Amino acid sequence: HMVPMDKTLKEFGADVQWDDYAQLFTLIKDGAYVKVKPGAQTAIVNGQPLALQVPVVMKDNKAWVSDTFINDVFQSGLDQTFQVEKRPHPLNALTADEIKQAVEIVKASADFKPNTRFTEISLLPPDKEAVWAFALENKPVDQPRKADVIMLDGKHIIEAVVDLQNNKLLSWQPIKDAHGMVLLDDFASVQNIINNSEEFAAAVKKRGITDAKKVITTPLTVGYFDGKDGLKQDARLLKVISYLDVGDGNYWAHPIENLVAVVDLEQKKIVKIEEGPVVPVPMTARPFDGRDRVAPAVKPMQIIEPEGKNYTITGDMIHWRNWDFHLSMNSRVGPMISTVTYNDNGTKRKVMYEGSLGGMIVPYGDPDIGWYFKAYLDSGDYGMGTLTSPIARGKDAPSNAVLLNETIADYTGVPMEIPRAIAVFERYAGPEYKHQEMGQPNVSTERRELVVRWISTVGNYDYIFDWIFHENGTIGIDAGATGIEAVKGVKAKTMHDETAKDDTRYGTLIDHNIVGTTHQHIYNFRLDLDVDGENNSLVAMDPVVKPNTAGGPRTSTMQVNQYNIGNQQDAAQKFDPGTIRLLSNPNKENRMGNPVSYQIIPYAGGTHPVAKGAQFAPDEWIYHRLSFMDKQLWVTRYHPGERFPEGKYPNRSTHDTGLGQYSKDNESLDNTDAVVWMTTGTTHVARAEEWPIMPTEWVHTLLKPWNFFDETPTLGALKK
Amino acid sequence: MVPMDKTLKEFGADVQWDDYAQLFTLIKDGAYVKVKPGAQTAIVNGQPLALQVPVVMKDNKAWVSDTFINDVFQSGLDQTFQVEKRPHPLNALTADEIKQAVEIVKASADFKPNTRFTEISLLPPDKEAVWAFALENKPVDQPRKADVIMLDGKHIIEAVVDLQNNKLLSWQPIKDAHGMVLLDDFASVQNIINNSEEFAAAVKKRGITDAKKVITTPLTVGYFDGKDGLKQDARLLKVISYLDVGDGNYWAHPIENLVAVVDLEQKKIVKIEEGPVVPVPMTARPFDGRDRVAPAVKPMQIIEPEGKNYTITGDMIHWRNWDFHLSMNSRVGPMISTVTYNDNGTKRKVMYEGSLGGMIVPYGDPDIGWYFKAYLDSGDYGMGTLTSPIARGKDAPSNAVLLNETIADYTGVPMEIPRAIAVFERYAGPEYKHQEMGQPNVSTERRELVVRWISTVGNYDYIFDWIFHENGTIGIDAGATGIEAVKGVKAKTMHDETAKDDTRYGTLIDHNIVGTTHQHIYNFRLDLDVDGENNSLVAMDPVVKPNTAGGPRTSTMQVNQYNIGNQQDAAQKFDPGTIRLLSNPNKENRMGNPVSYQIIPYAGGTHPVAKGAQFAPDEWIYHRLSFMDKQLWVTRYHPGERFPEGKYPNRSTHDTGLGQYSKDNESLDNTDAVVWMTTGTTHVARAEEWPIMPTEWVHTLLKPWNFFDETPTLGALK
Ligand SMILES: [Ca+2]
Ligand SMILES: [Ca+2]
Ligand SMILES: [Cu+2]
Ligand SMILES: [Cu+2]
């Protein structure tokens, strides 16, 4: 029984190329590079021959394969990219079965109710010392596996801990005052509640909208204003902004300006409609999907690895050159990079226990009724892992990437497999080093980087995060932003109209009747670096110009002021990119007697203007609630429950329960387990080039080995 | 018949054999060729080609006709290079024009024996005429001229020659100018040191048994108002010395605190400065892999089997909506000219000429071997002349096209630099994406076109990338790799007695080796013509202001916008939280905003950033080179103002560069402007950079700012 080759291979997600001159198919998926000729008894997979019982059959210019071809070829074993894990790593995420088990254990208590949802079901952090002992010594972890299960019972948060080995509930703790994140069903509830409101339909009608069934809602968290917003603190509320669907696939281009509904999600009712002046809806079609555009005819470019990859993925463990690390997915913050070591001539040296996104915020700058409260805490309030955007193969990542599927719990407690959740890819990155000595043979080597890429979309914006492993020990973390801008409906068509100056006070006029309201993008990364060990110190090195006291003609010299930063409050600081900040191991030295260190660079560049802090006065509630926005470098003492720069429950928070709190007390940062937090931000002033869709803009951060090694790390293995 | 593997390798093509498909794949620059043994046809960039003589296998080796290379690679099916029927007026001097210019000046009775040539370059025609050629095909009327700058012993003379008419137009000695360092000066310095008994005796005192193992490096001496003891009218170089121990890396064996001053006209050492004796660090530190074995790596290829999206017509590059002209200069290297963006069928001016302006690498140590040390790499040494040929597949990706470029050498003889510039297209992540919840994804791929050039001046190697984005952005990135300039010291580790004094001015990166702290400072000269000649400089400073509109917010995000109408105010520190635009106040986009480019002199870097010059303001280097201490400069277009350090910076007594060009109160309002961007790092060394430094980068950007009406990569409308 035969199937059409071209169609079957495309369903499966393989690239299929036919070469009529060579009479050769080239088939590519992930780590498999396959060559096969019609009628041939053998195919080639990653340079190795594979017998085929049934050859590819060509027949009236149409290829047909066996029913078993895809499994015979792609799952043969000749693609060595993925390997089976011997003993399960203790940081492996919860499996589908473990998720279902956690949900049965809590559903077996008297307290569970059928409206009860799950904000997060995740592995409970096992003991760090034990996890490192498993990674470095293969010591089994004796403590049993547990899950944190965070429930939303109507509006109340409850934290449960389940023991998975012994199948029992270990704790069940109500968290008073905490509001829950926004859950997927809240999007539909809001849209339904608005569709059923007579009051809302009348409001919409007086702003020009004839058909209220064409109104698209979007849910926003309301923040906290100590009652100036007129919103009761006890209630589960969301604000709702509206747009008109005109059939262009881009409702974001048709704001219904100055109409905000406040929805109570327990009562399932609109509890308040805020109405400002009437601004006609911008109606012109502004598709971003190409429906109105001519297709480009570009010549092909492929990045090919025809003998397979240089990395191996064993369960969730990635091995690549001198690097080893574990890669898992969390529903709130997305990818977690753990137990990162560097193999230095046979000895695995610790670099990082856990790194991930801490949290992020996109706060707006306009005081009007549709805007004043508007701030996306994308991970904390919406769940960025849950909103992972599957990688578009060859576009969102290069043609030579491997795309990983990842499993998390949805809000009803059912496993969901996110397809193409993460891309892994090696890339050429210019020369690693070069020296052309005059009159001698050249010396050049190529640089290779391993990239781990993940994309999450929250409403209008799409965020790309790259964790970049350099062969030489450097680690990069880059954050990219694309998607559709949040825009304000205005009366001005051009800057010559009467209202233009007022309409553009808080943002640029980027289309007729459309203003891209000014805002910031602020990302924070939590990096539990363990620089060649647990016990580290924060060291400052400030390059300075000093008077020359040594004689000769110079008046000045270049020197460095070096000092330790021994307490947390002083560690929380602005980053001057002219200075050097190290996390050093004062217990271990390189061959020159210098403490082995990593240099921390929270700002290594970007393509939008940089935020030097929060673009808010210090008496703003958002400023008070979210200290992480205003400093670029923080260092705190390791604590397994201090994970989020915005705090665990940021929705309508009244005070800072994140980095403001974690860095508040002054215990010592001297020779102890430190956690580094980097904040990097931009100030986004809009331009017409960014509308109707924004070209990807990037910010860059770096961690560089600083006397961690004894010489150029990529020179190669010593032959004597 | 000739053997295929041997013949194709001498041609510079990559040959791959696939035994399964019985197929040769042959790759060189824009040609991607497939050919089966015995076949009567081949494929070149996806197109069929009839062969006169099939590829023949003899004893499992392939043989081809002796005409095969011409027939296949020069078939016309590779369309990467097209013939230039009407030459662009900024085309660099050809080999024949260089020889002719030299014969014109040699025919003058004023030409003296042994005269050398510091620079032989096109005298650029009139800017208006050049734009009218590029935009309207209008022939330039005035004839081909060359500037010929001669060094007669130590004396500079500037001549101009008319090449069409074959005559000398002018001959002008330049009073008080010192010439740059020329190739023969390196050998003179070495010879002069080798013949000095006095120097050999000094070397002997410092523990060197064989004085013929001493390697010299020539350095310019700068200017210190006589405090260095040095006569201002003499042609001098200072000489720093190293020991050759046979490891290929003399840089790793400094002979510390010994400096010779050579007078190049007298051909003698005129001064020897001798400081404390520090034993030479002796341990072998090769960087070339003689003592190493690389790990095995699986292959990666970047292939474009239908050819390239760019075409190269003479020196004119066309790619997507971009058109520009690429030429080579002996001092500054590549010049990118007449840059337009094709906006829905209409070519719009972006940049008349952009290039490296100049650069400086100045050191922070006051000791005798260091206080004067400041490499003006382009101005003093000639970075174009010192271009490093691209190592194919390593210095640029495997899908690059490598261009040869021709300049004059110091004796006036044309010199063809093989693989002088790389051109390549690269994948650069998604151009944009939106995954609307519950809807089909929208994603498109980003492509960038990179023009890459490498120059090596002594110990350091510099890489410059000019990056054209499809969406109208231009990036300029500068990379540094090579071997650090190091100081010999007594300390082996930071536990030794001298360690603290030894590391006052740099990190201990090896036993007895300190990487002295210094800066890398680059300046780019960018004659942007934003949709036209007449432009203005506009500041937009995002600020937090009190809320006056009501409701709960105490503050708002607003912008202070203002014009910068004077050159003196235009010379400024760059705050990367602000926006600086070059705007065309005569032309607006669809929303009534002036068409503009945003100038970003600091878009990041991998070393610490220089906020300006790491020098007290009474230092002579600080006074001579103002360009070091501000990141943005804007001046009025003048064809003779091209170098931020000045025309003749060797032993300059005052700033004849950007300090002079920006000095006067003249208007930048609605006039032809030139932007200069200074970007730099402060390099504090580490062990990971020794014996060879992994490439470090700095990034700059020019972004269209309401130049267009919408997302520029959406495509043309149906
Ligand atoms: Ca730590
Ligand atoms: Ca201009
Ligand atoms: Cu934005
Ligand atoms: Cu340097």
From Swiss-Prot, chain A:
It catalyses: a primary methyl amine + O2 + H2O = an aldehyde + H2O2 + NH4(+); 2-phenylethylamine + O2 + H2O = 2-phenylacetaldehyde + H2O2 + NH4(+). Residues 645-666 are annotated as: Disordered. PROSITE patterns: COPPER_AMINE_OXID_1, COPPER_AMINE_OXID_2. Cu cation binds at residues 519, 521, 684. It comes from Escherichia coli (strain K12). Substrate binds at residues 376-387, 458-463. The keyword ATP-binding does not apply. One of its GO terms (biological process) is phenylethylamine catabolic process. Mn(2+) binds at residues 528, 530, 673. This is Primary amine oxidase.
Swiss-Prot record, chain B:
Homodimer. Its EC number is 1.4.3.21. One of its GO terms (molecular function) is calcium ion binding. Its cofactor is Cu cation; Zn(2+); Ca(2+); L-topaquinone. Topaquinone (TPQ) is generated by copper-dependent autoxidation of a specific tyrosyl residue. The keyword DNA damage does not apply. This is Primary amine oxidase. It catalyses: a primary methyl amine + O2 + H2O = an aldehyde + H2O2 + NH4(+); 2-phenylethylamine + O2 + H2O = 2-phenylacetaldehyde + H2O2 + NH4(+). One of its GO terms (biological process) is amine metabolic process. Cu cation binds at residues 518, 520, 683. It is found in: Periplasm. The active site is at 377 (proton acceptor), 460 (schiff-base intermediate with substrate). Pathway: Amino-acid degradation; L-phenylalanine degradation; phenylacetate from L-phenylalanine: step 2/3. Substrate binds at residues 375-386, 457-462. It is an enzyme of class 1 (oxidoreductase).
